[PDB]
Each structure stands twice: as C-alpha cells, then as structure tokens.
Amino acid sequence: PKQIERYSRFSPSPLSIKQFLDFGRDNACEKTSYMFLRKELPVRLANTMREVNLLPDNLLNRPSVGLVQSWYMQSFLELLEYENKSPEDPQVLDNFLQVLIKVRNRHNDVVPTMAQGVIEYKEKFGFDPFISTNIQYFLDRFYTNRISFRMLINQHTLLFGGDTNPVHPKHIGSIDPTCNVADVVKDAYETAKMLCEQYYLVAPELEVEEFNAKAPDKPIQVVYVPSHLFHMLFELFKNSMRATVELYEDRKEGYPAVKTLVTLGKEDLSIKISDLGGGVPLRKIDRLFNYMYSPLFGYGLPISRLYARYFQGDLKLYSMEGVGTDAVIYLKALSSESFERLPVFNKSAWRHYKTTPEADDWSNPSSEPRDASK
Amino acid sequence: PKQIERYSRFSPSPLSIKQFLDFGRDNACEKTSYMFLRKELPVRLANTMREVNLLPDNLLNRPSVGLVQSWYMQSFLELLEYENKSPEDPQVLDNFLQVLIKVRNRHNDVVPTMAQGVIEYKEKFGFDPFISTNIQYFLDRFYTNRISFRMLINQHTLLFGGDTNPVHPKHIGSIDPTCNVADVVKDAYETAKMLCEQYYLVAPELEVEEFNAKAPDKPIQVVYVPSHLFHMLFELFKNSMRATVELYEDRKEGYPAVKTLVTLGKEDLSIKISDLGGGVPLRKIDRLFNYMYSPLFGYGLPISRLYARYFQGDLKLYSMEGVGTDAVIYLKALSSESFERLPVFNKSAWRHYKTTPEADDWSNPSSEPRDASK
Amino acid sequence: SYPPHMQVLLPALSPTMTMGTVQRWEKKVGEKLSEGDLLAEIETDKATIGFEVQEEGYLAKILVPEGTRDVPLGTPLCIIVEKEADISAFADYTDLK
Amino acid sequence: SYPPHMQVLLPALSPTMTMGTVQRWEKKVGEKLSEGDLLAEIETDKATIGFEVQEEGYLAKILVPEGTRDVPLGTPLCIIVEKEADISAFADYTDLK
Numbered sequence A, B: 001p002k003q004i005e006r007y008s009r010f011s012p013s014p015l016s017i018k019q020f021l022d023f024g025r026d027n028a029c030e031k032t033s034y035m036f037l038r039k040e041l042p043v044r045l046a047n048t049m050r051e052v053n054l055l056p057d058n059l060l061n062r063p064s065v066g067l068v069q070s071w072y073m074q075s076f077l078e079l080l081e082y083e084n085k086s087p088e089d090p091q092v093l094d095n096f097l098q099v100l101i102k103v104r105n106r107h108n109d110v111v112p113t114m115a116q117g118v119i120e121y122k123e124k125f126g127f128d129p130f131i132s133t134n135i136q137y138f139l140d141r142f143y144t145n146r147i148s149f150r151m152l153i154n155q156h157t158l159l160f161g162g163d164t165n166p167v168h169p170k171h172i173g174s175i176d177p178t179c180n181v182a183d184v185v186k187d188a189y190e191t192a193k194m195l196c197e198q199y200y201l202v203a204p205e206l207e208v209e210e211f212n213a214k215a216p217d218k219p220i221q222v223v224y225v226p227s228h229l230f231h232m233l234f235e236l237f238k239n240s241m242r243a244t245v246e247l248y249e250d251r252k253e254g255y256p257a258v259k260t261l262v263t264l265g266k267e268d269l270s271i272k273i274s275d276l277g278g279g280v281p282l283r284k285i286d287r288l289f290n291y292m293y294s295p296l297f298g299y300g301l302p303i304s305r306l307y308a309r310y311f312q313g314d315l316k317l318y319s320m321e322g323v324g325t326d327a328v329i330y331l332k333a334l335s336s337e338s339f340e341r342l343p344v345f346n347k348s349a350w351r352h353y354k355t356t357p358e359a360d361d362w363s364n365p366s367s368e369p370r371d372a373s374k
Numbered sequence C, D: 001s002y003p004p005h006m007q008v009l010l011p012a013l014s015p016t017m018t019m020g021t022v023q024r025w026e027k028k029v030g031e032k033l034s035e036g037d038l039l040a041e042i043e044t045d046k047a048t049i050g051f052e053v054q055e056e057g058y059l060a061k062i063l064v065p066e067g068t069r070d071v072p073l074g075t076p077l078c079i080i081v082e083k084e085a086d087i088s089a090f091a092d093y094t095d096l097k
C-alpha cells in the first residue's frame, strides 16, 4: 500500500456531462479514453480505500468491509498493470476493455455488501451520535465514488465495446442528449405503481404539469443520464405512494393523486413530487437521509440524493406535518455546468475521521427542567 | 475583564415557553425573577462579548463594533451591582427594574449599529469566503442572544413594571397563550400590502387555508410570542409581494395571489407562504441567508430565521426557478418543547473563530476545463 | 507514593448550580486529553452542559461513574496524569510544577 | 549563509499534470504552517486543487506570485523555515536534520 498512499494523494479529475458528450459525439478516440481511465480509476479507488482504512476498528473488522476492501484492492492492482502499456497496440486496448467488464462485475454487490457491514456493526455495537455522523460522511463519499466509477466504466464500454445492436442507439454511451423529463417521470411512476398495487391492491394516480420558462410550450428536455434520473424518481414515487395509500387505507375520502411539476429556468431543471400522505414532523426530516437510523433497507433516500448531488444538483424534502410532503430534485439545466462532484482524500477528509466529540456550540435544556409554577 | 472571562465560562440557562407561561400565570413572584435575571443577563452578555473579541481585528476596529462592545460592557457592569443586593428589600427590586428599562434603551440600536460595522468592514476590506462564513456564524449567535435578552427583559418589565393599563391584558408578559395564527398572518399581510401598494401602486391578494389535523375544524391556535411570529410573516410576505409584482409589472396576465397554508400536527405548527414570483436558482438560495452578500438592508431573511430557530423552530425556503417560491416557518406545536436556543461560548465556539481555510473535501473543476471535442 | 496527578473537581458551571448529574463520560480511561476537549455531559435543573477538559494529559481514573445524580460542587470527578506511562499506578483507588 | 530552510516544489498533483497555475496563496509570509494546512489553490486543465502543506514551520518567502500560469513541475514555490526568528533573513531572494 505504498502505491495506494501515492494514488490516494493524487487529486481526482471531475468531468462534465458536456465533456462526456463532446468526447463521445465529436471525438470518440479509444486511445484517449484509455490514457484517461488507466490513471483515473486507480486514483478514485485509492482515494476511497484510504478512507475505508480510517473507519472505526469495530466496523473495519466486519467481514463485509474486509471483503469490499479486497475487491477494491484486486481492482486497483489489475488496473495498475496498464500504466506502462502502450495504446499504439490494438491488443492492449482490447484487454483493458475486458478488465473493465471484470471490475464492473466484481463490484456488482459492493452497495449491499457495504450496507451489510454497517448493519452488522450497528446491531453488534449500538448506535452512537458522533460515530453515526462519521459513517454518514463515509457512506456518502464511498457511494458517490462507486457511482462515478460505474459512470466512467460504462462510457468506455458502451463506446468501444463494439456492440452491434445498442439498446439506446441515439444516446452517447449512457447519456441521452435529449432526455424528455416527463417520459422518465411517467416510466418511474409506472414501475412504482406496479409494486405498490401488488402489495396494497391500489395506488394513487400520477398528474404531471410542466413549465418551460426557457420556451413556454416545448416539452422539457435535458442532457442527462436517464438511468440516474429514473432511480431518483422511482424512489420518491415509491415513498409518496406508500404514504398516500397508508394514510387513506381506513378513510372514505378516496385517494389523492401524486403530483409532479417539472420546471425549466435559466439554471435549474426542477422536479417537485407532492403528495398528501400526511407528512413528517420536521425533527425527523434529517434522519430520513441517515443510513443507520434508516414492505417495499433505508437507502433509497440517501442514495437518491447522492445521484442528484453527483452532477451538481440536489434533492430536498419539505413537509407539513398533518397534510403532506414535497420532494424536489434539482438538476443543472446546462450540461456545461454539470460537473462530477467527487470525494477527494486529503487532510480535510482525514480530519473528519479523526474528530472526537466536542461540546455543543448552542445550549441544551435539562431533561427534567425546573417547574416554574412553584 | 476577569469578571467577563468568568461569566463567559458560565453556561446560559435556556427557558421554555411553558416555563415563561407557568411562571407568569401561576407564580409571578418578582423575587424569583430578580434572582434569575440578575445572574442570567450578565451570563448571556459575557458569552457574547467573548465572541465579539474573537472577531478579525479589521472588523473589531470599526467604531460601530467598539461602540457595541462598550454598550454591552456598560450593561454588564450595571447588572453586576445586583449580585449582592437582597430581594427582601422592595427598594432593590424597584431599582433593578429601572436598570432593565435603561439597558433595554441603551440596546435599542444594537442591530443597526452592528450591521453598520460589518458594512463598514466589507466595503473597506473586500468580501472573503472563509471570513464571510465566520461573520455569519458570529451574527447568528450575536443576534439570537440579543433577541433572548429582549425576551427576558420584556417578561420581567411586563410582569412587574406594575402597568395599570396593559396593551394586551390577557397575555402573559409578551406571550399569548391563545395566539390565533391566521389573525397574525392577516395582520402581517396587511402591513406588507400597505408598503407594497405605496411604492408599486398594486399588491397581490392573500389567500389563507388551514388544516388542523389535531382537531379538523378548530381555528389554529398556538402558545407563542405574537410579535416574533409577526416579524417572520411580514418579512416573507414583503419578499413574496415584491417578487410577484416585479414579475407581472410588464405582463397582461393579472397578479397571482400569495397563498398561505397553516397546518397543525402532533409536533409541528407549519406556515407555508407560496408565491408565483418566478423563483430563484438553487445556487442562490443559501446566499439569501448571508448578511454580507445581502426599495422596501439584506437582514430580513436571516433575522426571521433566527426568530424561528430561537424556540426550536426553523425557516426554510424552496424555489422552482421559473415559477415561484415556498417559504415555510416551522414552530413547535407544544410549549413544553419550545426551549430557547442560546449561543454558548466554550472551546467549540472558539474553534469556529480560530479556523483557517482548509482544502475542499470534495473535488472542484478547472475554470477552463479541457476541451474533450479535440 | 503516586506519580504526579491532578483531580478534576465539579465546578459551579452556571451561577446557581449547587450540584450536577454526571450523565455521560466522553473520554475513556487511557485517552489523551487536550485543553477544551469534551469530558462529560453534566445535567442540572437548568441545562445539559458540555463540560470541557481544562488541562491536558491522560485520563487516569474515573471517580464518579456515569449516572450519578446530585454530585455536589467540589467532588473529585476523575484523576488526570501528565504521561501515559503513569496510568497503571491509578487502577488502585508536587512535581506537578 | 542562510538559516536552515526548505523549498516547496510543485508536485504532479494528479497523474497527468505537467504544470499548474498558482491561483491563490492561502498562507501569508510570517504565518505558522501545520502539516495539512491549505497552502495554495493550484489550477490545471483538469481540476482546481487544494494544495496542502506537507511539513511544519513558517512561511519564509513566496517564490511564485499569485496568478502565475503554467508553472512547471519541480519549480520552487516558496521557502519554509523551522523557527519564526529566521524569517527576516529571507527578505533577500544541512542542520535541517
């Protein structure tokens, strides 16, 4: 792990949707992609591995965590073979591609395996505030890197895998230059509806409105990765449907629709999913994004928000307890402003793992406050 | 300032609305209030003074900041006279009250004076990221303490000032045990409408809906300080009206209403003000709460949110750029859960003033990223 | 006898405080203490207070266990030593210059 | 001649980096440097990178001013000294054991 220290000290190179698109449409030179990836992938792995090493020992010890580490090590080492192998050889080029397939395969279970690890750790050592926020910090970073890893690999395999019959032939790798947002909204709805009907025997209807301020009558389109947007929508629709159907299961009123407003401004594409599922007290809003606080695993909301933040967007939730909840996905309207947001291992990151509890900054009441009556 | 060090090391004693109410309704013993305040007020002042001393020197140097410090010092010293003066003397009791009036008066301009200071400092030394967030941290704490200071003084003067003709006779000091939320909403609206009509010669209408989940037909009432809630509403209504009227000033459509939903759940009283004033890109949402980024001084939104957070509530803004904005005030439904949230001076606080810039945790793109096309 | 050490006494952490409950220890026996680290939550009648370490060293021994109510002002709460080499001596309950 | 000092050379901060722009200094001449403090923003083609101090001391002198584009790998960027007493010597541009 001298090679890991060194790679972990390198800074990652965040790419924009624009760049992925410009590269795939106008360039699409395999050499170039190889020279980039043979280096960028070990940099990204090493940045993460260094952070997994900083985890509390009780968590580091879990077989699931140790298994993830060794998958990452195996991948890192396999990619490092390519540091001194010339692109000017169509032979190297082809093996490198196979290597990408292999590491993508090896990494397929990373998310559930890691989750397993922290579940093992929570159930065996109890839930602790300062450690909790630490794990949160870690998982956000670790899962975002995993997402970016799969992004890079998919672009290269989709572009150079030499596939005769591409599933989405007008796309650039996994990027749809004309992604119709409402269509992805309807598809995500339908697939949630299906799972909700299966178990509850009923599901609210979707209503979709659009407002394209950019140009008021045109269908809203964005340059984006449709599978990412799909994942986000599906997760929110599923939450909205569950809450709606659970609330009205003993009422006579009839189920309110789940509403979607899609809007496009100079900078933002925004998607608001509103339900009348009764809402959630403010005190619990932030826990909904905790992995370890947590029919139909408490990962849907944190992972969804990682997909949104990954290209400089965000995912926010706002409730009125007693009535309902708005969930808003914000994406960048412009591909030139949609840069990867990648965790960098440095001293700032290290400090987050090395911080011990501090006194609260702000006051806290007694759990048994003095009775002011007498 | 040995006395200041010592008092700054004391911890503040956060009170609940319940306690203020139970004390004023069922007890209302002046002795008790004196014994509390003669100590609590110097503790709160000293906690703040210590923090103003940690400000950057360029800011500390501004005559406005130096003037605030000496007002606080003067107040601190005047209150410290009372540490060894017996309550069992109706004479002491009366002078202490006069002292409270005097310090309330002396403090009347604190907010504008401090603002002046940071304005002087920004215009003279330029806007700086790591220092900006520092000032933000400081102002939130400093203004909240000032609010809590005025809370405590008002309760004592209102309860024992011996006023023959109280403005709000059924209230407990400044606490309304049956504050009708919609009435305060209408009043805040009307007074914004007035200022908006004066300058723009037009103003949107208010629409108010309620949903009392606690008990579906009853007017929503809360135990609260009406002047605080008023301040919050007025500020949001003014923003909503300005945005609405500015957007439609060149349109033929006719002005959309400003809508208010008031909801009451087991824990939350929520108030959502929605407008169609065209919204605000996400990137700018957080700056709206900066004092120094900043017709009708950029303090309305940060101060309003300090009032909300002060009794464990919050104030949040969510926009869809191209259409409009929702602003939500969250208050605690239960007075027993509405504790003051007070800034405590300790090492945690000190660290915030002593922190130098660190490397970003997460990646940042080049300002001139490589052209992937060629 | 014992290596150079120091007792941490429970102060009045608020001006009216006469006693406090040791709600939670935030340091373990063995751990390094820096000035300003969080040492314990102390609960009163009036507040839950983050009690900070005022002198650096190592936690040698805990005198008052987690959960002790109504501990008076002045009671020794724990023993602190300069170097970690000295800790083992205190599993038994002036060059401190 | 000069008191014990150390040159901070511009590393390859990313694997493809051959040069960088010194966008911003985050430390002043005179200031104490701890290991891991933010020293400069370095801009490439590929990223804006927070460059961290790797050895502690004091900033003695800045060699490359803010705004210098295309500084090669290896160029001395600044001079660091052990004690602050030594700084004044460097307003003039091996016991470092």
Ligand SMILES: Nc1ncnc2c1ncn2[C@@H]1O[C@H](COP(=O)(O)OP(=O)(O)O)[C@@H](O)[C@H]1O
Binding pocket: A235, A239, A240, A243, A275, A277, A278, A279, A280, A288, A294, A296, A297, A298, A299, A300, A301, A302, A325, A327
């Ligand atoms: N729209 C919504 N309405 C009401 N409650 C919600 C909504 N969205 C999320 N929640 C709450 O937040 C929790 C976390 O959601 P998530 O992370 O998707 O995990 P899961 O759905 O597996 O619980 C849910 O269990 C639910 O209690």
Ligand SMILES: Nc1ncnc2c1ncn2[C@@H]1O[C@H](COP(=O)(O)OP(=O)(O)O)[C@@H](O)[C@H]1O
Binding pocket: B235, B239, B240, B243, B275, B277, B278, B279, B280, B288, B294, B296, B297, B298, B299, B300, B301, B302, B325, B327
């Ligand atoms: N409802 C709203 N709609 C559109 N823009 C808003 C809204 N609320 C606030 N803003 C923006 O946020 C800014 C800050 O508001 P505030 O702190 O009240 O100061 P001021 O109103 O004096 O500018 C406003 O200048 C405006 O640009």
Ligand SMILES: [K+]
Binding pocket: A007, A008, A009, A010, A011, A012, A047, A344, A345, A346
């Ligand atoms: K790194």
Ligand SMILES: [K+]
Binding pocket: A287, A288, A289, A290, A291, A294, A298, A299, A300, A301, A302
């Ligand atoms: K969750």
Ligand SMILES: [K+]
Binding pocket: B007, B008, B009, B010, B011, B012, B047, B344, B345, B346
């Ligand atoms: K204090």
Ligand SMILES: [K+]
Binding pocket: B287, B288, B289, B290, B291, B294, B298, B299, B300, B301, B302
């Ligand atoms: K503002």
Ligand SMILES: [Mg+2]
Binding pocket: A235, A238, A239, A300, A301
């Ligand atoms: Mg879910």
Ligand SMILES: [Mg+2]
Binding pocket: B235, B238, B239, B300, B301
């Ligand atoms: Mg305003």
